[PDB]
Structures are given as structure tokens and as C-alpha cells.
Amino acid sequence: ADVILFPSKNGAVTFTHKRHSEFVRECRSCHEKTPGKIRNFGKDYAHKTCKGCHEVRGAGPTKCKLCHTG
Ligand code: HEM
Ligand code: HEM
Ligand code: HEM
């Protein structure tokens, strides 16, 4: 889906999946060879990938509550 909701014990995360493709050139930057559900998706994968990219690019939320907005 273009907008994906991630339930979380630390607050739901609203992910603009489609919008992110306007900023991220490759599906592979977040996906395995085949784009689709990510088997090991969770805290570790998310904090490394989601937070990590935001940190390196200086755009996107890195503060807990700015991502865990639910
Ligand atoms: C045009 C390239 C992309 C394609 C073809 C693609 C395709 C998909 C598909 C088919 C799904 C599964 C939807 C479902 O659950 O039915 C999905 C989920 C997802 N995609 Fe993408 N995606 C692309 C780019 C991105 C990018 C750039 C990111 C990271 C910024 C990303 C992150 C994710 C995440 C986190 C999920 C949820 C996985 C899960 O809940 O297991 N995608 N994507
Ligand atoms: C599932 C993991 C991710 C989550 C939960 C996430 C969440 C967010 C959120 C909450 C925003 C605020 C703007 C919006 O919602 O559209 C955002 C912005 C952004 N994200 Fe992510 N993101 C993820 C992965 C990534 C990745 C992997 C990259 C880089 C490869 C990335 C690059 C960006 C950039 C550049 C922005 C700023 C866009 C703007 O200027 O409006 N994000 N992201
Ligand atoms: C240091 C600040 C942060 C703290 C304390 C925090 C804490 C947590 C915790 C405790 C979990 C697991 C909750 C559970 O078991 O359901 C989690 C999962 C996650 N976090 Fe964070 N987080 C932080 C920052 C971020 C940021 C900045 C993002 C988005 C850019 C983010 C995205 C996520 C996502 C998508 C998950 C996985 C959700 C799922 O299981 O589907 N977190 N976080």
C-alpha cells in the first residue's frame, strides 16, 4: 500500500511508502531482491534502516516520538 501503518508498543508508525520512492531511488535500499513483505521487519530492522537513512541524509525523523506518532 502507498501508506503503511505499523502498530508498535512504543506508538504506531505511519509510513509513507509510495512517497518515499520520490526520495529513494531503489526499492532494494529497503527490500530484499524481490520487493514485498520483509520477513525480519521489526525494531532492529527499522531502527537500522528507517532511522539510519534519516540520520545520514539529515532529513526524516530521528527523534523517537517524531516517528512513533501513534
Ligand atoms: C519501487 C520500489 C518498491 C517496490 C516495488 C516496493 C514494493 C513493496 C511491496 C509489494 C510491499 C508489500 C505490500 C504488502 O504487504 O502487501 C512493500 C512493503 C514495504 N516496503 Fe516497499 N517497495 C518499494 C520501495 C520501498 C522503499 C524505498 C522502502 C524504504 C524507504 C520500502 C519499504 C517497505 C516496507 C518497510 C514495507 C513493509 C514490509 C513489511 O511490513 O513486512 N519500499 N513494498
Ligand atoms: C520503514 C522505515 C521508514 C520509516 C518508518 C520512515 C518514516 C518517515 C517519516 C515519518 C517521514 C516524515 C515525512 C513523511 O512521513 O512522508 C520520513 C521522511 C523521510 N524519509 Fe523516511 N522512513 C523510513 C525509511 C526511510 C529510508 C530507508 C530512507 C532513505 C534510504 C528514508 C528517507 C527519508 C527522507 C529523505 C525523508 C524526508 C522527506 C521530506 O523531505 O519530506 N526514509 N520518513
Ligand atoms: C531512540 C528513539 C526510539 C525509541 C526509544 C524507539 C523504540 C522502539 C521500540 C521499543 C520498538 C519495539 C516496540 C514493540 O515491541 O512493538 C520500536 C519499533 C520500531 N520503531 Fe522505534 N524507536 C525509536 C525511534 C524510531 C524512529 C526514529 C523510527 C522511524 C524513523 C522508528 C520506527 C520503528 C518501527 C517501524 C518499529 C517496528 C514496528 C513493527 O514491529 O512493525 N523508531 N521502536
Side-chain angles (χ1 to χ4, degrees):
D2 288 3
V3 178
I4 302 171
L5 304 181
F6 295 122
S8 176
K9 297 181 179 180
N10 193 223
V13 176
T14 297
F15 176 52
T16 54
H17 185 227
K18 182 61 173 57
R19 183 166 185 279
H20 270 68
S21 280
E22 301 184 65
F23 296 89
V24 185
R25 186 70 191 87
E26 293 197 58
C27 310
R28 195 70 184 281
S29 290
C30 303
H31 286 286
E32 294 298 315
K33 293 182 180 181
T34 295
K37 295 175 296 181
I38 301 172
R39 306 168 185 176
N40 57 8
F41 188 79
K43 182 183 64 60
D44 300 310
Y45 165 91
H47 290 176
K48 165 63 66 181
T49 67
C50 306
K51 186 173 178 292
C53 177
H54 293 172
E55 186 56 54
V56 63
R57 298 201 180 181
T62 55
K63 299 189 64 178
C64 310
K65 56 182 180 181
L66 300 183
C67 191
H68 285 281
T69 62

Coordinates of all heavy atoms in Angstrom, one line a residue:
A1 N 0.9 -1.2 0.0 CA 0.0 0.0 0.0 C 0.9 1.2 0.0 O 2.0 1.2 0.4 CB -0.9 0.0 1.2
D2 N 0.3 2.4 -0.5 CA 1.0 3.6 -0.5 C 1.3 4.2 0.9 O 2.4 4.8 1.1 CB 0.2 4.7 -1.3 CG 0.2 4.4 -2.8 OD1 0.8 3.4 -3.2 OD2 -0.4 5.2 -3.5
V3 N 0.4 3.9 1.8 CA 0.6 4.3 3.2 C 0.5 3.1 4.0 O -0.6 2.4 4.0 CB -0.4 5.4 3.6 CG1 -0.2 5.7 5.1 CG2 -0.3 6.6 2.7
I4 N 1.5 2.8 4.8 CA 1.5 1.6 5.6 C 1.5 2.0 7.1 O 2.3 2.8 7.5 CB 2.7 0.7 5.3 CG1 2.7 0.3 3.8 CG2 2.7 -0.6 6.2 CD1 3.9 -0.4 3.4
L5 N 0.7 1.3 7.9 CA 0.6 1.6 9.3 C 1.3 0.5 10.1 O 1.0 -0.7 9.9 CB -0.8 1.7 9.8 CG -1.7 2.8 9.1 CD1 -3.1 2.8 9.7 CD2 -1.1 4.1 9.2
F6 N 2.3 0.8 11.0 CA 3.0 -0.1 11.8 C 2.6 0.0 13.2 O 3.1 0.9 13.9 CB 4.5 0.1 11.6 CG 5.0 -0.2 10.2 CD1 5.7 0.8 9.6 CD2 4.9 -1.4 9.6 CE1 6.2 0.6 8.3 CE2 5.4 -1.7 8.3 CZ 6.0 -0.6 7.7
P7 N 1.8 -1.0 13.7 CA 1.5 -0.9 15.2 C 2.7 -1.1 16.0 O 3.6 -1.8 15.5 CB 0.5 -2.1 15.3 CG -0.1 -2.2 13.9 CD 1.1 -2.0 13.0
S8 N 2.8 -0.5 17.1 CA 4.0 -0.6 17.9 C 3.8 -0.3 19.4 O 2.9 0.5 19.8 CB 5.1 0.4 17.4 OG 6.3 0.3 18.3
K9 N 4.5 -1.1 20.3 CA 4.3 -0.9 21.7 C 4.9 0.5 22.1 O 4.7 0.9 23.3 CB 5.1 -2.0 22.5 CG 4.5 -3.4 22.2 CD 5.3 -4.5 23.0 CE 4.7 -5.8 22.7 NZ 5.5 -6.9 23.5
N10 N 5.6 1.1 21.2 CA 6.2 2.4 21.5 C 5.4 3.5 20.7 O 5.8 4.7 20.7 CB 7.6 2.5 21.2 CG 8.3 3.7 21.7 OD1 9.1 4.4 21.1 ND2 8.0 4.1 23.0
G11 N 4.3 3.2 20.1 CA 3.5 4.1 19.4 C 3.5 3.7 17.9 O 4.5 3.4 17.3
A12 N 2.3 3.8 17.3 CA 2.2 3.4 15.9 C 3.0 4.3 15.0 O 3.2 5.5 15.3 CB 0.7 3.5 15.5
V13 N 3.5 3.7 13.9 CA 4.4 4.5 13.0 C 3.6 4.6 11.6 O 3.2 3.6 11.1 CB 5.7 3.8 12.7 CG1 6.5 4.5 11.6 CG2 6.5 3.7 14.0
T14 N 3.5 5.8 11.1 CA 2.8 6.0 9.8 C 3.9 6.1 8.8 O 4.7 7.1 8.8 CB 1.9 7.2 9.8 OG1 0.9 7.1 10.8 CG2 1.3 7.4 8.5
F15 N 3.9 5.1 7.9 CA 5.0 5.1 6.8 C 4.5 5.4 5.4 O 3.7 4.7 4.8 CB 5.6 3.7 6.8 CG 6.7 3.5 5.7 CD1 7.7 4.4 5.5 CD2 6.6 2.4 4.9 CE1 8.6 4.2 4.5 CE2 7.6 2.2 4.0 CZ 8.6 3.1 3.7
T16 N 4.9 6.5 4.9 CA 4.6 7.0 3.5 C 5.4 6.2 2.5 O 6.3 6.7 1.9 CB 4.8 8.5 3.4 OG1 6.1 8.8 3.7 CG2 3.8 9.3 4.3
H17 N 5.0 4.9 2.3 CA 5.7 4.0 1.4 C 5.9 4.6 0.0 O 7.0 4.6 -0.5 CB 4.9 2.7 1.4 CG 5.5 1.6 0.5 ND1 4.9 0.9 -0.4 CD2 6.8 1.1 0.6 CE1 5.7 0.0 -0.9 NE2 6.9 0.1 -0.3
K18 N 4.8 5.0 -0.6 CA 4.9 5.5 -2.0 C 5.7 6.8 -2.0 O 6.6 7.0 -2.9 CB 3.5 5.7 -2.5 CG 3.4 6.2 -4.0 CD 4.1 5.3 -5.0 CE 3.9 5.7 -6.4 NZ 4.4 7.0 -6.7
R19 N 5.4 7.7 -1.1 CA 6.1 9.0 -1.1 C 7.6 8.8 -1.0 O 8.3 9.5 -1.6 CB 5.6 9.9 0.1 CG 6.2 11.2 0.1 CD 5.4 12.2 1.1 NE 5.9 13.5 1.0 CZ 7.0 14.0 1.7 NH1 7.7 13.1 2.4 NH2 7.4 15.2 1.6
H20 N 8.0 7.8 -0.2 CA 9.4 7.6 -0.1 C 10.1 7.3 -1.4 O 11.3 7.5 -1.5 CB 9.7 6.5 1.0 CG 9.8 7.0 2.4 ND1 8.8 7.5 3.1 CD2 10.9 7.0 3.2 CE1 9.3 7.9 4.3 NE2 10.6 7.6 4.4
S21 N 9.4 6.7 -2.3 CA 10.1 6.4 -3.6 C 10.4 7.7 -4.4 O 11.1 7.7 -5.4 CB 9.2 5.5 -4.5 OG 9.3 4.2 -4.1
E22 N 9.9 8.8 -3.9 CA 10.3 10.1 -4.5 C 11.6 10.6 -4.0 O 12.3 11.5 -4.6 CB 9.2 11.2 -4.2 CG 7.8 10.8 -4.6 CD 6.8 11.9 -4.3 OE1 6.9 13.0 -5.0 OE2 5.9 11.8 -3.5
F23 N 12.1 10.0 -2.9 CA 13.4 10.3 -2.3 C 14.4 9.2 -2.4 O 15.6 9.4 -2.3 CB 13.1 10.7 -0.8 CG 12.3 11.9 -0.6 CD1 10.9 11.8 -0.6 CD2 12.8 13.1 -0.5 CE1 10.1 12.9 -0.4 CE2 12.0 14.3 -0.4 CZ 10.7 14.2 -0.3
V24 N 13.9 7.9 -2.5 CA 14.8 6.8 -2.5 C 14.7 6.2 -3.9 O 13.7 5.7 -4.4 CB 14.3 5.7 -1.5 CG1 15.3 4.6 -1.4 CG2 14.3 6.4 -0.1
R25 N 15.9 6.2 -4.6 CA 16.0 5.7 -5.9 C 15.7 4.2 -6.2 O 15.0 3.9 -7.1 CB 17.4 5.9 -6.5 CG 17.6 5.6 -8.0 CD 16.8 6.5 -8.8 NE 16.7 6.1 -10.2 CZ 15.8 5.3 -10.7 NH1 14.8 4.8 -9.9 NH2 15.8 4.9 -12.0
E26 N 16.1 3.4 -5.3 CA 15.9 1.9 -5.4 C 15.1 1.2 -4.4 O 15.2 1.5 -3.2 CB 17.3 1.2 -5.4 CG 18.2 1.4 -6.5 CD 19.3 0.4 -6.6 OE1 19.0 -0.8 -6.7 OE2 20.5 0.8 -6.5
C27 N 14.2 0.3 -4.8 CA 13.4 -0.5 -3.9 C 14.3 -1.3 -3.0 O 14.1 -1.5 -1.9 CB 12.5 -1.5 -4.7 SG 11.6 -0.8 -6.1
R28 N 15.4 -1.7 -3.6 CA 16.4 -2.5 -3.0 C 17.1 -1.9 -1.7 O 17.6 -2.6 -0.9 CB 17.6 -2.9 -4.0 CG 18.5 -4.1 -3.5 CD 17.7 -5.4 -3.4 NE 18.6 -6.5 -2.9 CZ 19.5 -7.2 -3.6 NH1 19.8 -6.9 -4.8 NH2 20.2 -8.1 -3.0
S29 N 17.0 -0.6 -1.6 CA 17.5 0.1 -0.5 C 16.8 -0.3 0.8 O 17.3 -0.1 1.9 CB 17.4 1.6 -0.7 OG 18.4 2.0 -1.7
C30 N 15.6 -0.8 0.6 CA 14.8 -1.2 1.8 C 14.3 -2.7 1.7 O 14.0 -3.3 2.7 CB 13.5 -0.4 1.9 SG 13.7 1.4 2.0
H31 N 14.3 -3.2 0.5 CA 13.8 -4.5 0.2 C 14.9 -5.6 -0.1 O 16.0 -5.3 -0.4 CB 12.8 -4.5 -1.0 CG 11.5 -4.0 -0.6 ND1 10.6 -4.6 0.2 CD2 10.9 -2.8 -0.9 CE1 9.5 -3.9 0.3 NE2 9.7 -2.7 -0.3
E32 N 14.5 -6.8 -0.1 CA 15.3 -8.0 -0.4 C 15.2 -8.0 -2.0 O 14.5 -7.1 -2.5 CB 14.7 -9.3 0.1 CG 14.7 -9.3 1.7 CD 16.1 -9.3 2.2 OE1 17.0 -10.0 1.7 OE2 16.3 -8.6 3.2
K33 N 15.9 -8.9 -2.6 CA 15.8 -9.0 -4.1 C 14.4 -8.7 -4.6 O 14.2 -8.0 -5.6 CB 16.4 -10.3 -4.6 CG 17.9 -10.4 -4.3 CD 18.4 -11.8 -4.8 CE 19.9 -11.9 -4.6 NZ 20.4 -13.2 -5.1
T34 N 13.4 -9.4 -4.1 CA 12.1 -9.3 -4.5 C 11.3 -8.3 -3.5 O 11.2 -8.6 -2.4 CB 11.3 -10.6 -4.6 OG1 11.9 -11.4 -5.5 CG2 9.8 -10.4 -4.9
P35 N 10.8 -7.2 -4.1 CA 10.0 -6.3 -3.2 C 8.8 -7.0 -2.7 O 8.0 -7.7 -3.4 CB 9.7 -5.1 -4.1 CG 10.8 -5.1 -5.1 CD 11.0 -6.6 -5.4
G36 N 8.5 -6.8 -1.4 CA 7.3 -7.4 -0.7 C 7.5 -7.4 0.8 O 8.3 -6.6 1.3
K37 N 6.7 -8.1 1.5 CA 6.7 -8.1 2.9 C 8.1 -8.5 3.3 O 8.8 -9.4 2.7 CB 5.7 -9.1 3.5 CG 4.3 -8.8 3.2 CD 3.3 -9.8 3.7 CE 3.5 -11.1 3.0 NZ 2.5 -12.2 3.4
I38 N 8.7 -7.9 4.4 CA 10.0 -8.2 4.9 C 9.9 -9.1 6.1 O 9.5 -8.7 7.1 CB 10.7 -6.9 5.2 CG1 10.8 -6.0 3.9 CG2 12.1 -7.1 5.7 CD1 11.3 -4.6 4.1
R39 N 10.4 -10.3 5.9 CA 10.4 -11.3 6.9 C 10.9 -10.9 8.3 O 10.3 -11.3 9.3 CB 11.2 -12.6 6.4 CG 10.7 -13.1 5.1 CD 11.7 -14.1 4.5 NE 11.3 -14.5 3.2 CZ 12.0 -15.3 2.4 NH1 13.1 -15.8 2.8 NH2 11.5 -15.6 1.2
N40 N 12.1 -10.2 8.4 CA 12.6 -9.8 9.7 C 12.3 -8.4 10.0 O 13.0 -7.7 10.8 CB 14.1 -10.0 9.7 CG 14.8 -9.3 8.6 OD1 14.2 -8.5 7.9 ND2 16.1 -9.6 8.5
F41 N 11.2 -7.9 9.5 CA 10.8 -6.5 9.8 C 10.5 -6.4 11.3 O 9.9 -7.3 11.8 CB 9.6 -6.1 9.0 CG 9.3 -4.6 9.2 CD1 10.0 -3.6 8.5 CD2 8.3 -4.2 10.1 CE1 9.7 -2.3 8.6 CE2 8.0 -2.8 10.2 CZ 8.8 -1.9 9.5
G42 N 10.9 -5.3 11.9 CA 10.7 -5.2 13.3 C 11.6 -4.1 13.8 O 12.1 -3.3 13.1
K43 N 11.7 -4.0 15.2 CA 12.5 -2.9 15.8 C 14.0 -2.8 15.2 O 14.4 -1.7 14.8 CB 12.6 -3.2 17.3 CG 13.4 -2.1 18.1 CD 13.5 -2.4 19.5 CE 14.3 -3.7 19.8 NZ 15.7 -3.6 19.2
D44 N 14.7 -3.9 15.2 CA 16.1 -3.9 14.8 C 16.2 -3.5 13.3 O 17.0 -2.6 13.0 CB 16.7 -5.3 15.0 CG 16.8 -5.7 16.4 OD1 17.2 -4.9 17.3 OD2 16.4 -6.8 16.7
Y45 N 15.4 -4.1 12.4 CA 15.5 -3.7 11.0 C 15.1 -2.3 10.8 O 15.7 -1.5 10.1 CB 14.5 -4.6 10.2 CG 14.2 -4.0 8.8 CD1 15.0 -4.4 7.7 CD2 13.2 -3.1 8.6 CE1 14.8 -3.8 6.5 CE2 13.0 -2.5 7.4 CZ 13.8 -2.9 6.3 OH 13.6 -2.3 5.1
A46 N 14.0 -1.8 11.5 CA 13.5 -0.5 11.4 C 14.5 0.6 11.9 O 14.7 1.6 11.3 CB 12.2 -0.3 12.0
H47 N 15.1 0.4 13.1 CA 16.0 1.4 13.6 C 17.3 1.5 12.8 O 17.9 2.6 12.8 CB 16.3 1.1 15.1 CG 15.1 1.3 16.0 ND1 15.0 1.0 17.3 CD2 13.8 1.8 15.7 CE1 13.8 1.4 17.8 NE2 13.1 1.8 16.8
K48 N 17.7 0.4 12.2 CA 18.9 0.4 11.3 C 18.6 1.1 10.0 O 19.3 2.0 9.5 CB 19.4 -1.0 11.1 CG 20.4 -1.1 10.0 CD 21.7 -0.4 10.3 CE 22.4 -1.0 11.5 NZ 23.6 -0.2 11.8
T49 N 17.5 0.7 9.4 CA 17.1 1.2 8.0 C 16.4 2.6 8.0 O 16.8 3.5 7.3 CB 16.3 0.2 7.3 OG1 15.0 0.0 7.9 CG2 17.0 -1.2 7.2
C50 N 15.3 2.6 8.8 CA 14.5 3.9 8.8 C 15.3 5.0 9.4 O 15.5 6.0 8.8 CB 13.2 3.6 9.6 SG 12.2 2.2 9.0
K51 N 15.6 4.8 10.7 CA 16.3 5.9 11.4 C 17.7 6.1 10.8 O 18.2 7.3 10.7 CB 16.5 5.4 12.9 CG 17.1 6.4 13.9 CD 17.0 5.9 15.3 CE 17.7 6.9 16.3 NZ 19.1 7.0 16.1
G52 N 18.4 5.1 10.4 CA 19.7 5.2 9.8 C 19.7 6.1 8.6 O 20.6 7.0 8.5
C53 N 18.8 5.9 7.6 CA 18.8 6.8 6.5 C 18.5 8.2 6.8 O 19.2 9.1 6.3 CB 17.8 6.3 5.4 SG 17.7 7.4 4.0
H54 N 17.6 8.4 7.7 CA 17.2 9.7 8.1 C 18.4 10.4 8.7 O 18.7 11.6 8.5 CB 16.1 9.7 9.2 CG 14.8 9.2 8.7 ND1 13.7 8.9 9.4 CD2 14.4 8.9 7.4 CE1 12.7 8.5 8.6 NE2 13.1 8.5 7.4
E55 N 19.2 9.7 9.5 CA 20.4 10.2 10.1 C 21.5 10.7 9.1 O 22.0 11.8 9.2 CB 21.0 9.2 11.1 CG 22.2 9.7 11.9 CD 21.8 10.9 12.7 OE1 20.8 10.9 13.5 OE2 22.5 12.0 12.6
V56 N 21.8 9.8 8.1 CA 22.8 10.1 7.1 C 22.4 11.2 6.2 O 23.2 12.1 5.8 CB 23.1 8.9 6.3 CG1 21.9 8.4 5.5 CG2 24.3 9.2 5.3
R57 N 21.1 11.3 5.8 CA 20.6 12.3 4.9 C 20.2 13.6 5.6 O 20.1 14.7 4.9 CB 19.4 11.8 4.1 CG 19.8 10.6 3.3 CD 18.8 10.4 2.1 NE 19.1 9.3 1.3 CZ 18.5 8.9 0.2 NH1 17.4 9.5 -0.2 NH2 18.9 7.8 -0.5
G58 N 20.0 13.6 6.9 CA 19.7 14.8 7.6 C 18.3 15.2 7.4 O 17.9 16.4 7.7
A59 N 17.4 14.3 6.9 CA 16.0 14.6 6.7 C 15.3 13.4 7.2 O 15.7 12.2 7.1 CB 15.8 14.8 5.2
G60 N 14.0 13.6 7.6 CA 13.3 12.5 8.2 C 13.5 12.5 9.7 O 14.5 12.9 10.2
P61 N 12.5 11.9 10.4 CA 12.6 11.9 11.9 C 13.6 10.9 12.5 O 13.8 9.8 12.0 CB 11.2 11.6 12.4 CG 10.7 10.7 11.3 CD 11.2 11.4 10.0
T62 N 14.4 11.4 13.5 CA 15.3 10.5 14.2 C 14.9 10.5 15.7 O 15.3 9.5 16.4 CB 16.8 11.0 14.1 OG1 16.9 12.4 14.5 CG2 17.3 11.0 12.6
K63 N 14.2 11.5 16.1 CA 13.7 11.5 17.4 C 12.5 10.5 17.6 O 11.6 10.5 16.7 CB 13.2 12.9 17.8 CG 14.3 14.0 17.7 CD 13.8 15.3 18.2 CE 13.5 15.3 19.7 NZ 13.1 16.6 20.3
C64 N 12.5 9.7 18.6 CA 11.5 8.7 18.9 C 10.1 9.1 18.6 O 9.5 8.4 17.8 CB 11.6 8.3 20.4 SG 13.3 7.9 21.0
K65 N 9.6 10.1 19.3 CA 8.2 10.5 19.1 C 7.8 11.1 17.8 O 6.6 11.3 17.5 CB 7.8 11.5 20.2 CG 8.7 12.7 20.3 CD 8.3 13.6 21.5 CE 9.2 14.8 21.6 NZ 8.9 15.7 22.7
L66 N 8.8 11.4 16.9 CA 8.6 12.0 15.6 C 8.3 11.0 14.6 O 7.9 11.2 13.5 CB 9.7 12.9 15.2 CG 10.0 14.1 16.2 CD1 11.1 15.0 15.7 CD2 8.7 14.9 16.4
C67 N 8.6 9.7 15.0 CA 8.4 8.6 14.1 C 7.3 7.7 14.7 O 6.3 7.3 14.0 CB 9.6 7.8 13.9 SG 9.5 6.6 12.6
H68 N 7.4 7.5 16.0 CA 6.4 6.8 16.8 C 5.3 7.8 17.2 O 5.3 8.3 18.3 CB 7.0 6.2 18.0 CG 7.8 5.0 17.7 ND1 7.3 3.7 17.5 CD2 9.2 4.8 17.7 CE1 8.4 2.9 17.3 NE2 9.5 3.5 17.4
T69 N 4.5 8.2 16.2 CA 3.5 9.3 16.5 C 2.1 8.8 16.9 O 1.3 9.6 17.4 CB 3.3 10.1 15.2 OG1 2.8 9.2 14.1 CG2 4.6 10.7 14.7
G70 N 1.8 7.5 16.8 CA 0.6 6.9 17.1 C 0.3 7.0 18.6 O 1.2 7.3 19.4
Ligands
HEM1 C1 9.5 1.0 -6.5 C2 10.3 0.2 -5.4 C3 9.5 -0.5 -4.4 C4 8.6 -1.5 -4.6 C5 8.3 -2.2 -5.9 C6 8.1 -1.9 -3.3 C7 7.1 -2.9 -3.2 C8 6.6 -3.3 -1.9 C9 5.6 -4.3 -1.8 C10 5.0 -5.2 -2.8 C11 5.3 -4.4 -0.4 C12 4.3 -5.3 0.2 C13 2.9 -4.8 0.4 C14 2.0 -5.8 1.1 O1 2.3 -6.0 2.3 O2 1.1 -6.3 0.5 C15 6.1 -3.4 0.2 C16 6.2 -3.2 1.6 C17 7.1 -2.4 2.2 N1 8.1 -1.6 1.6 FE1 8.3 -1.3 -0.4 N2 8.6 -1.1 -2.3 C18 9.4 -0.2 -2.9 C19 10.2 0.7 -2.3 C20 10.3 0.9 -0.9 C21 11.3 1.7 -0.3 C22 12.2 2.7 -1.0 C23 11.2 1.5 1.0 C24 12.0 2.1 2.2 C25 12.1 3.6 2.2 C26 10.2 0.4 1.2 C27 9.8 -0.1 2.4 C28 8.8 -1.1 2.6 C29 8.4 -1.6 3.9 C30 9.0 -1.2 5.2 C31 7.3 -2.4 3.6 C32 6.6 -3.2 4.7 C33 7.2 -4.6 4.8 C34 6.5 -5.4 5.9 O3 5.6 -4.9 6.6 O4 6.9 -6.6 6.0 N3 9.6 0.1 0.0 N4 6.9 -2.7 -0.7
HEM2 C1 10.1 1.8 7.3 C2 11.3 2.7 7.6 C3 11.0 4.2 7.5 C4 10.1 4.9 8.2 C5 9.2 4.3 9.3 C6 10.2 6.2 7.8 C7 9.4 7.3 8.3 C8 9.5 8.6 7.8 C9 8.7 9.7 8.2 C10 7.7 9.6 9.4 C11 9.0 10.8 7.5 C12 8.3 12.1 7.5 C13 7.7 12.5 6.2 C14 6.7 11.5 5.7 O1 6.0 10.8 6.5 O2 6.5 11.4 4.4 C15 10.1 10.4 6.6 C16 10.8 11.3 5.8 C17 11.9 10.9 5.0 N1 12.4 9.7 5.0 FE1 11.8 8.0 5.9 N2 11.2 6.4 6.8 C18 11.7 5.1 6.6 C19 12.7 4.7 5.8 C20 13.5 5.6 5.1 C21 14.7 5.3 4.3 C22 15.3 3.9 4.3 C23 15.2 6.4 3.8 C24 16.5 6.6 2.9 C25 17.0 5.4 2.1 C26 14.3 7.5 4.2 C27 14.4 8.8 3.7 C28 13.5 9.8 4.1 C29 13.7 11.2 3.7 C30 14.7 11.8 2.8 C31 12.7 11.9 4.3 C32 12.4 13.4 4.1 C33 11.3 13.6 3.1 C34 10.8 15.0 3.1 O3 11.7 15.9 2.9 O4 9.6 15.3 3.2 N3 13.3 7.0 5.0 N4 10.4 9.0 6.8
HEM3 C1 15.5 6.4 20.5 C2 14.1 6.7 19.9 C3 13.3 5.4 19.7 C4 12.8 4.5 20.6 C5 13.0 4.6 22.1 C6 12.1 3.5 19.9 C7 11.6 2.4 20.5 C8 11.0 1.3 19.8 C9 10.6 0.1 20.4 C10 10.6 -0.2 21.9 C11 10.2 -0.7 19.4 C12 9.5 -2.1 19.6 C13 8.1 -1.9 20.1 C14 7.3 -3.2 20.0 O1 7.8 -4.3 20.5 O2 6.2 -3.2 19.5 C15 10.3 0.0 18.2 C16 10.0 -0.5 17.0 C17 10.0 0.2 15.8 N1 10.5 1.6 15.7 FE1 11.3 2.7 17.1 N2 12.1 3.8 18.5 C18 12.8 5.0 18.4 C19 13.0 5.7 17.2 C20 12.4 5.3 16.0 C21 12.4 6.1 14.8 C22 13.1 7.4 14.6 C23 11.6 5.4 13.8 C24 11.2 5.8 12.4 C25 12.2 6.6 11.6 C26 11.2 4.2 14.5 C27 10.5 3.2 13.8 C28 10.2 1.9 14.4 C29 9.4 0.9 13.7 C30 8.9 0.9 12.3 C31 9.4 -0.2 14.5 C32 8.9 -1.6 14.2 C33 7.4 -1.7 14.2 C34 6.9 -3.1 14.0 O3 7.2 -4.0 14.8 O4 6.2 -3.3 12.9 N3 11.6 4.1 15.8 N4 10.8 1.3 18.4

